[PDB]
Amino acid sequence: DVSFRLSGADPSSYGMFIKDLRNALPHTEKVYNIPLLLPSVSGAGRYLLMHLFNYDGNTITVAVDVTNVYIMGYLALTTSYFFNEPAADLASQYVFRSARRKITLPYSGNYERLQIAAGKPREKIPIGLPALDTAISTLLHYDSTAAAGALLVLIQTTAEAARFKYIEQQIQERAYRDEVPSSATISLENSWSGLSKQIQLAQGNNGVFRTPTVLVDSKGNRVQITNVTSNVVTSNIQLLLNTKNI
């Protein structure tokens, strides 16, 4: 299981935690040198548990589906919380079984629903390590509205970071000062599926995308991705959603 402690955390250890997180996700083949996530995994092995310690030392353990990196729920002391969706439902059958009581949140785990519950788009939610420390603290003491925003932070400083090196770096820059994500970061988070798909469909198409993926670069400019030589593919994306799950 992968751990990360916010006390004494700096860009280096966060990077190491994020590396650990990538290493914990199983894969058989690589596509254009990028680990390909399994189509499916049966049993409790389908879930990865992240122990997260906030600055004061308090911890929550988060359950992640290793086939897509989606957070399914988490455990705070003796209570367990899972999103209101089938996947998480299934997941609750394998993790945090010993929790003295289980709560299901009033929303599913997709950004659309979390932004509603939180009452604000993630474009306006500062992220960073300090922000992660808050999020961890927030989830310990239940408040579905607060948790929604906390989860939007956790998902991005965790899952999205593992998936994209750019995002990992965005977080390292925000190690001592939170800042809303650049729209490039949002652009990526929303293109993971499309990119995972087009990168796989390129395997038999000479590394050329059947359909190009439109993103926004760091300068804020609209940009098209047509082939695996792009830096997005050669340098950025670190994991790929298996096309079986698309």
Ligand X SMILES: O=c1[nH]cc(F)c(=O)[nH]1
Ligand Y SMILES: *[C@@H]1O[C@H](CO)[C@@H](O)[C@H](O)[C@H]1NC(C)=O
- Is residue 230 a contact residue for ligand Y (CB under 6 A)? yes
User: What single-letter amino acid sits at 136?
Assistant: I
Query: Of these partners, ligand X, ligand Y, none, which one is at the site of residue 230 (CB under 5 to 8 Å by kind)?
Result: ligand Y
- Is residue 2 a contact residue for ligand X (CB under 6 A)? no
The count of residues in the chain is 246
Query: Of these partners, ligand Y, ligand X, none, which one is at the site of residue 153 (CB under 5 to 8 Å by kind)?
Result: none
- Is residue 155 a contact residue for ligand X (CB under 6 A)? yes
CA angle 222-189-158, nearest 5°? 140
- Is residue 110 a contact residue for ligand X (CB under 6 A)? yes
β-strand pairing of 34-35 with 30-31:
antiparallel
The least distance separating ligand X from the CB of residue 68, rounded to whole angstroms, comes to 7
Number of residues located near ligand Y, criterion CB under 6 A? 4
Stretch that binds ligand Y, among 118-126, 187-195, 225-233, 235-243 (CB under 6 A): 225-233
Choice from 229, 235, 244, 246 touching ligand Y (CB under 6 A):
229
User: Rounded CA gap, 139 and 144, in Å?
Assistant: 9
Q: Draw the binding track, 132-161, toward ligand Y (x: CB under 6 A; -: no contact).
A: ------------------------------
User: Rounded CA gap, 37 and 47, in Å?
Assistant: 13
Would you state the structure tokens that stand for residue 239, as one six-digit string? 């994991």
The least distance separating ligand Y from the CB of residue 191, rounded to whole angstroms, comes to 15
User: What single-letter amino acid sits at 53?
Assistant: F
Choice from 14, 47, 70, 74 touching ligand X (CB under 6 A):
70
- Is residue 202 a contact residue for ligand X (CB under 6 A)? no
Stretch that binds ligand Y, among 78-86, 111-119, 149-157, 227-235 (CB under 6 A): 227-235
Could you confirm whether 160 is annotated as catalytic?
Answer: yes
- Is residue 149 a contact residue for ligand X (CB under 6 A)? no
**Binding site membership: which residues?**
69-71, 85, 109-112, 122, 160, 163
Q: Which residues bind ligand X (CB under 6 A)?
A: 69-71, 109-111, 155, 159
**Binding site membership for CDP: which residues?**
70-71, 85, 110-112, 163
Q: Which residues bind ligand Y (CB under 6 A)?
A: 226-227, 229-230
Please give the positions annotated as active site.
160
